């Protein structure tokens, strides 16, 4: 691997992000299995969410690929776990690094963006009935993210 | 009083600040050290962003608190 | 009586020898302390050296010490190879995202890196030579 | 009989003295080894000192003012100068002081300034304070 | 063999050279270290400039001679 | 003094130019008394030539001032010792330094430029009867530069 990938990979093992676990796949050195703790004071609090992260060939020129593997009720995460986050597409630059992405994803959980153009349909519920959406987020956390 | 800012690259800088200082003011000091304009800085403390009109006192940021910088 | 006197003299000599041995031991302890201080001084020097190495003269894109350092109009620097690859997709600084208006080679950065790296291990020097060849 | 006893005791004392002398010799040898180790350590650190004092003086000094670069600017020809120095030069001549190529561009360099601050930080407080004074003077 | 070049700032660099090397060739190696193009370099040895087509052998420059660089 | 002047001044004392002595004046830190040895294989060989050097206020923006104080027969040195050298006027840049000037002056002795536009009148002799001019240069060296 390029020095940077080696650098980040071992920084993850040595200096773990708070509330986030990130372990290398047993077969693919560019493939990581991530667990994000639901952020404090969020409707996801108490839950644990699986994510997978892949570093493409052209990384860091190309953005890392990230997807939720745990079902979650969130305006910026779709039914297949795909994440709507502009630093994963639009605002990606080689200086950002992996843990920036992971913290940003965690922050997305902490502060959802229902007003996003390419947002779910969950977004609409989040806009018009935020209280109900937050309870449903908590409901889905109970259902899918407690084991 | 001093506070720490963890920059984009994960390095730490020290800022000289007062409890009365606004967030805009702190971002101005970050621009001087990092060259990132205030409108591109999002500062995070205790998992939440810090809004421009508010002060450090308002967010209970104290002596040697660490603020985190993202875009 | 003469034998007893001789024995007493021998005992005195033994005591003197013991005192000399104690003095030698004290000197050895002092030498050890000095050696420890020297090690600490060398350790501090090593720390100062790993200072510029690891966070500093490194390109943010590849995390290697800059290879053919170039400085943009926005005052940020990158490897020539790394920024040239980046600019195949975006004409903006990877760090500050300002539009790139100029790209300038920096002899001072290159000479400083080359001169410092020349003092490090064979492993470090060789990696750099390989990377330059690969990029070439 | 106390005769041979006293003589025997004297012989034992002599043997003890010889043993003590041998121990002293061993201690002296150990001390010599320690001294050699200290010398080796000094040589290891001496080289570092030499590198440090050919590091921060021969490559980070502006040719116009002979100070470590203050607000480093790099020209199109790849040479660097203090911002203050090169601007004063450019009021009179538009050729690089060093290579004399016509100056076509200037850019500041955060990396050079940050590197220099880190290096200077390891120098004497006289050098550090002089740099502070120039920075404010040229400000 | 090695020779020394005293650069514009009075610092010394070392060049790896052969007696057969031309002056142009030596100037190319100086450009790589100093960034001064060959046509702006005037190299001086024993008080005289060294002309481009000539070799080091032609000027009796040897092992550890010092060449002086001016504009 | 500016750091550069301090730097060069002490470089002159510590690292003397071959065949050139340069000492500071006892009253003026910008004033230097220089002695240049006649270059080998020149008609000035064996002679010693006094020069004075002054570093103006605006140095290094302004060129150093230099003049011969020893009478010399040379196309580019006039009767008052003024030196015709383009890096002392036209091609002066702050990167040049003092010792570059001094070596260049020495080199001028080693290789005169009779074809210079603003050259003496000695130049004319040097152009038309170079052999005689060189002997006269040697003559003046005997007369003025051997003490
Ligand atoms: Zn790079
Ligand atoms: Zn930039
Ligand atoms: Zn300067
Ligand atoms: Zn130049």
Curated annotation (Swiss-Prot), chains A, F:
<dbReference type="GO" id="GO:0005524">
    <property type="term" value="F:ATP binding"/>
</dbReference>
<feature type="modified residue" description="N6-acetyllysine">
    <location>
        <position position="79"/>
    </location>
</feature>
<keyword id="KW-0227">DNA damage</keyword>
<dbReference type="GO" id="GO:0097027">
    <property type="term" value="F:ubiquitin-protein transferase activator activity"/>
</dbReference>
<dbReference type="GO" id="GO:1904262">
    <property type="term" value="P:negative regulation of TORC1 signaling"/>
</dbReference>
<dbReference type="GO" id="GO:0003723">
    <property type="term" value="F:RNA binding"/>
</dbReference>
<dbReference type="InterPro" id="IPR023313">
    <property type="entry name" value="UBQ-conjugating_AS"/>
</dbReference>
<keyword id="KW-1015">Disulfide bond</keyword>
<dbReference type="GO" id="GO:0031371">
    <property type="term" value="C:ubiquitin conjugating enzyme complex"/>
</dbReference>
<dbReference type="GO" id="GO:0004842">
    <property type="term" value="F:ubiquitin-protein transferase activity"/>
</dbReference>
<dbReference type="GO" id="GO:0005654">
    <property type="term" value="C:nucleoplasm"/>
</dbReference>
<keyword id="KW-1017">Isopeptide bond</keyword>
<dbReference type="GO" id="GO:0043123">
    <property type="term" value="P:positive regulation of canonical NF-kappaB signal transduction"/>
</dbReference>
<dbReference type="GO" id="GO:0005829">
    <property type="term" value="C:cytosol"/>
</dbReference>
<keyword id="KW-0234">DNA repair</keyword>
From Swiss-Prot, chains B, E:
<feature type="cross-link" description="Glycyl lysine isopeptide (Lys-Gly) (interchain with G-Cter in ubiquitin)">
    <location>
        <position position="63"/>
    </location>
</feature>
<feature type="cross-link" description="Glycyl lysine isopeptide (Lys-Gly) (interchain with G-Cter in ubiquitin)">
    <location>
        <position position="27"/>
    </location>
</feature>
<feature type="cross-link" description="Glycyl lysine isopeptide (Lys-Gly) (interchain with G-Cter in ubiquitin)">
    <location>
        <position position="6"/>
    </location>
</feature>
<comment type="function">
    <text>Exists either covalently attached to another protein, or free (unanchored). When covalently bound, it is conjugated to target proteins via an isopeptide bond either as a monomer (monoubiquitin), a polymer linked via different Lys residues of the ubiquitin (polyubiquitin chains) or a linear polymer linked via the initiator Met of the ubiquitin (linear polyubiquitin chains).</text>
</comment>
<feature type="cross-link" description="Glycyl lysine isopeptide (Lys-Gly) (interchain with G-Cter in ubiquitin)">
    <location>
        <position position="11"/>
    </location>
</feature>
<feature type="cross-link" description="Glycyl lysine isopeptide (Lys-Gly) (interchain with G-Cter in ubiquitin)">
    <location>
        <position position="33"/>
    </location>
</feature>
<feature type="modified residue" description="(Microbial infection) ADP-ribosylthreonine">
    <location>
        <position position="66"/>
    </location>
</feature>
<feature type="modified residue" description="Phosphoserine; by PINK1">
    <location>
        <position position="65"/>
    </location>
</feature>
<feature type="domain" description="Ubiquitin-like 1">
    <location>
        <begin position="1"/>
        <end position="71"/>
    </location>
</feature>
<feature type="site" description="Essential for function">
    <location>
        <position position="68"/>
    </location>
</feature>
<feature type="cross-link" description="Glycyl lysine isopeptide (Lys-Gly) (interchain with G-Cter in ubiquitin)">
    <location>
        <position position="29"/>
    </location>
</feature>
<feature type="site" description="Interacts with activating enzyme">
    <location>
        <position position="54"/>
    </location>
</feature>
<protein>
    <recommendedName>
        <fullName>Ubiquitin</fullName>
    </recommendedName>
</protein>
<feature type="cross-link" description="Glycyl lysine isopeptide (Lys-Gly) (interchain with G-Cter in ubiquitin)">
    <location>
        <position position="48"/>
    </location>
</feature>
Swiss-Prot record, chain D:
<comment type="function">
    <text>E3 ubiquitin-protein ligase that plays a key role in DNA damage signaling via 2 distinct roles: by mediating the 'Lys-63'-linked ubiquitination of histones H2A and H2AX and promoting the recruitment of DNA repair proteins at double-strand breaks (DSBs) sites, and by catalyzing 'Lys-48'-linked ubiquitination to remove target proteins from DNA damage sites.</text>
</comment>
<comment type="subunit">
    <text>(Microbial infection) Interacts (via FHA domain) with phosphorylated human herpesvirus 1 ICP0 protein; leading to RNF8 degradation by the proteasome.</text>
</comment>
<comment type="similarity">
    <text>Belongs to the RNF8 family.</text>
</comment>
<comment type="subunit">
    <text>Homodimer. Forms a E2-E3 ubiquitin ligase complex composed of the RNF8 homodimer and a E2 heterodimer of UBE2N and UBE2V2. Interacts with class III E2s, including UBE2E1, UBE2E2, and UBE2E3 and with UBE2N. Interacts with RXRA. Interacts (via FHA domain) with ATM-phosphorylated MDC1. Interacts (via FHA domain) with 'Thr-4827' phosphorylated HERC2 (via C-terminus). Interacts with PIWIL1; leading to sequester RNF8 in the cytoplasm. Interacts with WRAP53/TCAB1.</text>
</comment>
<protein>
    <recommendedName>
        <fullName>E3 ubiquitin-protein ligase RNF8</fullName>
    </recommendedName>
</protein>
<feature type="zinc finger region" description="RING-type">
    <location>
        <begin position="62"/>
        <end position="100"/>
    </location>
</feature>
């Amino acid at each position: 691997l390029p020095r940077r990938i080696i650098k980040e990979t071992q920084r993850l093992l040595a200096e773990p992000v708070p509330g986030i676990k990130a372990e290398p796949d047993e077969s693919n050195a560019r493939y990581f299995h991530v667990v994000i703790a639901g952020p404090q004071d969020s409707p996801f609090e108490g839950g644990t969410f699986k994510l997978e992260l892949f570093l493409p060939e052209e990384y860091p020129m190309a953005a890392p690929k990230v997807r939720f593997m745990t079902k979650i009720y969130h305006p910026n995460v779709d039914k297949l776990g795909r994440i709507k986050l502009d630093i994963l597409k639009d605002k990606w630059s080689p200086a950002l690094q992996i843990r920036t992405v992971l913290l940003s994803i965690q922050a997305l959980l902490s502060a959802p963006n229902p007003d996003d153009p390419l947002a779910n349909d969950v977004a609409e519920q989040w806009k018009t009935n935020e209280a109900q959406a937050i309870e449903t987020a908590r409901a889905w956390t109970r259902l899918y993210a407690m084991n | 009083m001093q506070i720490f800012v963890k920059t984009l690259t994960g390095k730490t800088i020290t800022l000289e600040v007062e409890p009365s200082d606004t967030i805009e003011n702190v971002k101005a000091k970050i621009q001087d050290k990092e060259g990132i304009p205030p409108d591109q800085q999002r500062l995070i403390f205790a998992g939440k962003q810090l809004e421009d009109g508010r002060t450090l006192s308002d967010y209970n940021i104290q002596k040697e608190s660490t603020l985190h910088l993202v875009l | 009586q003469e034998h007893w006197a001789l024995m007493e003299e021998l005992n005195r000599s033994k005591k003197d020898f013991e005192a000399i041995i104690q003095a030698k031991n004290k000197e050895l302890e002092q030498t050890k302390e000095e050696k420890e201080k020297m090690q600490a001084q060398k350790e501090e020097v090593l720390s100062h050296m790993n200072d510029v190495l690891e966070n500093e003269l490194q390109c943010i894109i590849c995390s290697e010490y800059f290879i053919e350092a170039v400085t943009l109009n926005c005052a940020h620097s990158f490897c020539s190879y790394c920024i040239n690859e980046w600019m195949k997709r975006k004409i903006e600084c990877p760090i500050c995202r300002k539009d790139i208006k100029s790209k300038t080679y920096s002899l001072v950065l290159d000479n400083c890196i080359n001169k410092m790296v020349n003092n490090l291990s064979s492993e470090v020097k060789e990696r750099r030579i390989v990377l330059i060849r690969e990029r070439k």
